[PDB]
Amino acid sequence: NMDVIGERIRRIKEEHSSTWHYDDENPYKTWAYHGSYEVKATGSASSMINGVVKLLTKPWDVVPTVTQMAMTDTTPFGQQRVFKEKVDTRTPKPMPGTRKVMEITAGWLWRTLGRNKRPRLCTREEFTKKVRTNDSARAAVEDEEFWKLVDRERELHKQGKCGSCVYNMMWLGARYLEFEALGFLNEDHWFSRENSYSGVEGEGLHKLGYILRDISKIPGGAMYADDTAGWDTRITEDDLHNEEKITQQMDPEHRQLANAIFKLTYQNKVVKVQRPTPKGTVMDIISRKDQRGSGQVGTYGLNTFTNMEAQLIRQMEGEGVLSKTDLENPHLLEKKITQWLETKGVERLKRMAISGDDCVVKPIDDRFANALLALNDMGKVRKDIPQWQPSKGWHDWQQVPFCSHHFHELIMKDGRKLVVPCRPQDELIGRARISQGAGWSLKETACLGKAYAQMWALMYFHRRDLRLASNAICSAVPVHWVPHQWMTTEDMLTVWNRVWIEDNPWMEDKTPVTTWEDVPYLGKREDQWCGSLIGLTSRATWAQNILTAIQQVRSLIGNEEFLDYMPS
Ligand SMILES: CC(=O)Oc1ccc2oc(=O)sc2c1
Ligand SMILES: [Zn+2]
Ligand SMILES: [Zn+2]
Numbered sequence: 179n180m181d182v183i184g185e186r187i188r189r190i191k192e193e194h195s196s197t198w199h200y201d202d203e204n205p206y207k208t209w210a211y212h213g214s215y216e217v218k219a220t221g222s223a224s225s226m227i228n229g230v231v232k233l234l235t236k237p238w239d240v241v242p243t244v245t246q247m248a249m250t251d252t253t254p255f256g257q258q259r260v261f262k263e264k265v266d267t268r269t270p271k272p273m274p275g276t277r278k279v280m281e282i283t284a285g286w287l288w289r290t291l292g293r294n295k296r297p298r299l300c301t302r303e304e305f306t307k308k309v310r311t312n313d314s315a316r317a318a319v320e321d322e323e324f325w326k327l328v329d330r331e332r333e334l335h336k337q338g339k340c341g342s343c344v345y346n347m348m349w350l351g352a353r354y355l356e357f358e359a360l361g362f363l364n365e366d367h368w369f370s371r372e373n374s375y376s377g378v379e380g381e382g383l384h385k386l387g388y389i390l391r392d393i394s395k396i397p398g399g400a401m402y403a404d405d406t407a408g409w410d411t412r413i414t415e416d417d418l419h420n421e422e423k424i425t426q427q428m429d430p431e432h433r434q435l436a437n438a439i440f441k442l443t444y445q446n447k448v449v450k451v452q453r454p455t456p457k458g459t460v461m462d463i464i465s466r467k468d469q470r471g472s473g474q475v476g477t478y479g480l481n482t483f484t485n486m487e488a489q490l491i492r493q494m495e496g497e498g499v500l501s502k503t504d505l506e507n508p509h510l511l512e513k514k515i516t517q518w519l520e521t522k523g524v525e526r527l528k529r530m531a532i533s534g535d536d537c538v539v540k541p542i543d544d545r546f547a548n549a550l551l552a553l554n555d556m557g558k559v560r561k562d563i564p565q566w567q568p569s570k571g572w573h574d575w576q577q578v579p580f581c582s583h584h585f586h587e588l589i590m591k592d593g594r595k596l597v598v599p600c601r602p603q604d605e606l607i608g609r610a611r612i613s614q615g616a617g618w619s620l621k622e623t624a625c626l627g628k629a630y631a632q633m634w635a636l637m638y639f640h641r642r643d644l645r646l647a648s649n650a651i652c653s654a655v656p657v658h659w660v661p662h663q664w665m666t667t668e669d670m671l672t673v674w675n676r677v678w679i680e681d682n683p684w685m686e687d688k689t690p691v692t693t694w695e696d697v698p699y700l701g702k703r704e705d706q707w708c709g710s711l712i713g714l715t716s717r718a719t720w721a722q723n724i725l726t727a728i729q730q731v732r733s734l735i736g737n738e739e740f741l742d743y744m745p746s
């Protein structure tokens with residue numbers, strides 16, 4: 179406990195020797211509380227509306243989901259409330275047999291993931307380049323020799339000590355050191371689909387639907403997509419020990435630094451959290467030994483790894499490999515587990531799409547639906563369902579939720595088929611109406627709106643309202659103002675052809691599309707089912723007079739150069 183985190187706590191208290199105290203009105207139940215000092219609030223109850231896209235989406239002024247997205251509470255008041263929900267709980271220890279199959283599966287999964295690639299340290303030059311292309315963390319620290327502070331803390335890590343690696347709910351220094359030891363998982367694409375079979379790292383939203391359709395071709399039962407209640411809070415001490423096994427593939431200098439990250443920063447953590455008190459705002463210093471910190475490099479990759487392991491074990495239980503007697507058995511035999519992993523594991527990974535805590539799996543049959551002993555005992559309890567009620571799956575991949583989307587198959591006029599991402603339209607419009615940052619000119623606000631308009635033309639062109647609104651936004655913003663593929667000056671029909679035709683591996687016929695008229699929409703019934711306002715008179719009035727709203731935005735912007743992108 180204190181031998182690992184003590185030095186960090188001593189430096190925090192010494193820096194704030196004035197106003198340091200032990201408040202017993204602290205609410206912490208499952209975290210170790212250490213002390214508090216005096217800062218005052220950072221955050222807001224709601225953020226600003228993007229006025230450009232708001233002026234151009236008037237019928238959605240009267241939509242409750244759009245209004246709610248007036249940002250969440252980042253104030254210390256709102257910060258303490260998120261803490262009560264799930265962060266301040268304890269996950270029960272898994273049973274001894276459960277712990278063993280997790281260890282066996284983790285060993286096999288890391289060896290499979292490391293079959294072609296080798297771990298490596300990441301570099302100051304990589305970290306610096308990443309920042310520039312996107313005790314405070316800015317683009318201003320990497321040009322200053324603050325790398326000597328990084329250098330001094332690394333020497334502590336090499337001795338098994340930690341001095342200043344703390345996260346809140348040098349800071350950039352702690353995150354560089356984590357990137358240095360574990361950044362290879364992301365930078366060398368360990369969870370790409372080719373390397374991990376279940377992963378989708380770097381695939382991109384326009385590919386996820388095609389992947390789901392490919393999974394549907396595998397013989398088996400329904401497709402299951404269970405959400406876990408607060409996944410990051412359900413990462414156990416056993417989970418962290420299993421994730422640590424990647425260090426066995428490292429060179430000793432690398433192993434030493436990654437072992438320091440795992441033991442001192444993941445399996446012992448020191449956290450700052452703001453709290454309101456009748457005297458004001460207060461920064462509390464807390465610590466615990468399990469759960470995952472969301473503000474960390476490698477959070478995504480390690481969550482993907484542990485979810486891959488968890489879903490494999492659930493497939494195991496569905497197929498009869500694991501029983502309740504096995505999960506309780508402290509002397510469980512490895513044989514049947516290893517044999518299943520070596521004969522079936524890769525085939526079973528291919529039945530899954532897994533992005534962090536988000537998973538889709540198509541097991542060999544539907545026994546999986548009621549295979550819940552290991553899933554619950556591992557702590558990955560499903561959200562908003564009785565603990566032992568069978569999972570409900572889908573027999574249409576187009577109904578499966580993944581990455582906050584579902585995916586529609588679209589027949590183009592020329593007969594070729596697209597697979598497009600989609601979500602309830604109010605979520606897309608509600609997000610595009612939110613800017614963040616207080617001191618943002620009309621120009622920066624117009625550029626962000628243009629950025630949303632280009633994403634809509636590239637990803638959501640098939641929704642009638644969004645293509646209209648996207649065209650209206652781009653007509654209202656100067657053509658020469660410029661805001662992953664939707665941040666450029668290229669003609670959006672050109673970018674569309676590159677993404678959906680040219681570089682699309684599921685499009686055999688590379689024949690380019692020459693007009694937006696050849697770019698299809700969802701069927702009208704599906705468009706309305708997914709939130710379209712087409713068919714309402716307030717939408718027809720908006721569409722009919724949209725040039726008026728465009729010209730009003732142009733009048734206020736000034737005498738810049740505008741192009742008309744023809745919105746009705
Ligand atoms: C064929 C065509 O002109 O389509 C578009 C649509 C939106 C848009 O926003 C830009 O910056 S360029 C651009 C082109
Ligand atoms: Zn440290
Ligand atoms: Zn849809």
